[PDB]
């Protein structure tokens, strides 16, 4: 049995083998060195095509051979030293001059054509070319490049629903010309979105089908009554033929997927909303959060996708940006909704959002859900009993404020004290990016506009009242900066907001 490196070599040699390798030339010889049995030979010789034979030949060789020597020797024995040297070189570089292997041996042989093929066969979604959040796309690329030589790993691209994780993941893989081909030998992109108990299992049944996409699948087994161990063993077996595969698990919700990926020792790029699932790992974990688009980033977005570019006209735009809350998913739900190109009809929308929720700006963009709301519903349904409640009472709070704990400790339901409100608030920001916070000068939390617009039309308004006037009882018992302890005396600073209910 070969190791991954010895298999990468064969893989890298493919281009050469397809040109002048005829598996039959090697049968008598390998039978002689006791590597192939007469059966392996017929399983190989019988195929109707040379590529078919090469494919059968390589599966048996990876299983039976214990090193490339016999194959290297064979090629010199058949006067095809050009193939035997390539395999011998690859290995000598791999062992004695790594990090030179890719530059010298691997990279030389690889074209954009081959790269775009790997992507198709990998099921990678077509790369968006309009707006390209360069910073993030290159962070992914840089990290996938420095991690590429770890046996297995987890690169987490986490962020709020719609932040643009998926789009980024695709761009990083489609944009680079090194990653898929040089850094990694191939890729497998699969969308999870599992929520049921058998979701992870179904996920990995596909991975199995994926890794055996070029095997005989005439009698591929129904897996309805197969156990998890068996599914795994089968995936491990199939992995030998697929060295250095990058697995992209799109939209992971259940920590089970992380667990399986780890047991299978895969190299992974995971896109998720709940970074806490990474806690299931014991493997090397790296992260990159897809944060909300900055103020000027929303502009770049609005620019390339049509929208004009600005006194009182600018204000109107700044309002979209405030309501969009830097969420690319929501920002896009605007463009497709603003028939005109006038900041007017644009304003129409903005207002409608201020009048109905987000359901107003309902749409049919390339995103999965109709309204970012439905997309947030799921995040909410995966929260703890307590958190889902704490998150509910955050309704009664101004969007875009750096309000400190004691102030939150009012509306959020619960020796020690209310450090726990901080804990619940720290979780709603970790598991869904529903809220956020800053370490200093003094620890605080914030609730963005879109997530406030969401929270509004989701709780029997009889809960807002009960709370808004339960703060109206905590204010009496006691600007771009944080209100000092002497300020949590009043809530009138934000009255245009605390009263417009």
């Amino acid at each position: 049995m070969l190791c991954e490196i010895e298999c990468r070599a064969l893989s890298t040699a493919h281009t050469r083998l397809i040109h002048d390798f005829e598996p039959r030339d090697a049968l008598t010889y390998l039978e002689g060195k006791n590597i192939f049995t007469e059966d392996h030979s017929e399983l190989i010789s019988k195929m109707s095509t040379r590529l078919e034979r090469i494919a059968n030949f390589l599966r048996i060789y990876r299983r039976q051979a214990s090193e490339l020597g016999p194959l290297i020797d064979f090629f010199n024995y058949n006067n095809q030293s050009h193939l035997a040297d390539f395999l011998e070189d690859y290995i000598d570089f791999a062992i004695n001059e790594p990090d030179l292997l890719r530059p010298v041996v691997i990279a030389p042989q690889f074209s954009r054509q081959m790269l775009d093929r790997k992507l198709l066969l990998g099921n990678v979604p077509k790369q968006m070319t309009c707006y390209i959040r360069e910073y993030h796309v290159d962070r992914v690329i840089k990290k996938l490049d420095e991690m590429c030589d770890l046996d297995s790993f987890f690169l987490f691209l986490h962020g709020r629903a719609g932040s643009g994780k998926s789009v980024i993941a695709s761009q990083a893989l489609s944009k680079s010309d090194q990653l898929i081909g040089i850094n990694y030998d191939s890729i497998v992109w699969l969308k999870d979105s599992g929520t049921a108990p058998k979701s992870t299992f179904d996920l990995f049944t596909d991975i199995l089908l994926m890794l055996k996409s070029e095997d005989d699948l005439l009698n591929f087994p129904s897996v309805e009554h197969v156990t998890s161990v068996v599914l795994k063993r089968m995936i491990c077996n199939a992995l030998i033929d697929r060295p250095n595969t990058l697995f992209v698990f799109d939209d992971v919700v259940q920590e089970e997927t992380i667990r399986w990926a780890q047991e299978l020792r895969l190299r992974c790029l995971v896109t998720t909303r709940d970074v806490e699932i990474s806690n299931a790992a014991s493997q090397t974990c790296e992260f990159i959060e897809v944060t909300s688009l900055e103020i000027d980033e929303c502009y770049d977005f609005l620019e390339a996708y049509g929208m004009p570019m600005p006194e009182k006209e600018e204000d109107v735009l700044n309002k979209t940006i405030e309501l969009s809350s830097g969420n690319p998913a929501t920002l896009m739900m605007f463009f497709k909704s603003c028939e005109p190109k006038t900041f007017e009809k644009m304003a129409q929308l903005n207002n409608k959002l201020e009048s109905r929720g987000l359901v107003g700006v309902e749409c049919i963009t390339p995103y999965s859900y109709k309204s970012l709301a439905m997309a947030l519903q799921r995040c909410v349904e995966v929260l703890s009993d307590e958190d889902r409640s704490a998150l509910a009472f955050a309704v009664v709070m101004p969007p875009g404020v750096d309000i400190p704990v004691k102030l939150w400790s009012c509306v959020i339901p619960v020796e020690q004290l209310d450090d726990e409100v901080a804990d619940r608030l720290k979780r709603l920001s970790k598991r869904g990016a529903l809220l956020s916070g800053k370490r200093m000068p003094v620890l605080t939390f914030k609730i963005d506009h879109i997530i406030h617009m969401f929270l509004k039309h989701v709780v029997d308004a009889q809960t807002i009242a009960n709370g808004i006037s339960i703060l109206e009882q905590r204010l009496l018992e006691i600007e771009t900066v944080i209100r000092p302890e002497d300020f949590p005396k009043f809530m009138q600073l934000h009255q245009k907001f605390y009263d417009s209910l």
């Binding site: 397809i18 195929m47 109707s48 095509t49 040379r50 590529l51 078919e52 054509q113 081959m114 775009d116 093929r117 992507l119 198709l120 066969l121 990998g122 099921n123 990678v124 979604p125 077509k126 790369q127 489609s174 699969l190 969308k191 979105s193 049921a196 979701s199 179904d202 049944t205 596909d206 089908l209 994926m210 996409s213 070029e214 095997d215 005989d216 699948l217 005439l218 591929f220 129904s222 897996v223 309805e224 390339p366 999965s368 859900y369 109709k370």
Partner: protein
């Protein structure tokens, strides 16, 4: 016994034929599969013929297209075994495992289901899986057959051209 056939060429990967027809049929419904992978070299001539045949086919053989689509969509998640169960009848009945007829039928039926699936974000994200299942189900059958039964894309192309005309010839009679 030999050396690199039509169907073994990168530009003719069966996945290209499938992603394409799927993207196509879906557009023929106003919808647009934004999740579709990208074609390494854009739409190919052989891809266009598939659309034609795939079109001719859905018409004259739409028989069980909605019955089968029903069976496929009657589950939270579509699978490969289920998919194989439903489609082991599309294109052939009671034969080479992959005749041009079965190929067309499978891709035709696949694109059809692809559209229905799109008409519902719940059953949407699975078009990706249907793409895989359709690609693999054909792939393993063109494998050890097309060479010994004398099939190829060029041949298909020759046969597609005639069927295309003979069909438009009748559309005006």
């Amino acid at each position: 016994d030999g050396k690199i056939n039509d169907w073994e060429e990168p530009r003719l990967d069966i996945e290209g034929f499938v992603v394409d027809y799927f993207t196509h049929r879906i557009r023929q419904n106003g919808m647009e599969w934004f999740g579709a992978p990208g074609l390494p070299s854009g739409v190919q001539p052989e891809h266009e013929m598939m659309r034609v045949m795939g079109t001719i086919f859905e018409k004259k053989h739409a028989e069980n297209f909605e019955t089968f689509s029903e069976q496929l969509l009657a589950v939270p998640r579509i699978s490969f075994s289920l998919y194989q169960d439903v489609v082991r009848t599309v294109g052939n009945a009671q034969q080479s495992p992959m005749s041009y007829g079965r190929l067309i039928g499978l891709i035709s039926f696949g694109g059809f289901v692809a559209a229905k699936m799109m008409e519902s974000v719940e059953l949407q994200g699975q078009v990706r899986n249907l793409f895989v299942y359709t690609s693999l189900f054909i792939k393993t059958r063109i494998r050890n057959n097309w060479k010994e039964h004398n099939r190829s894309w060029d041949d298909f192309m020759t046969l597609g051209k005639q069927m295309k005309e003979d069909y438009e010839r009748a559309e005006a009679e």
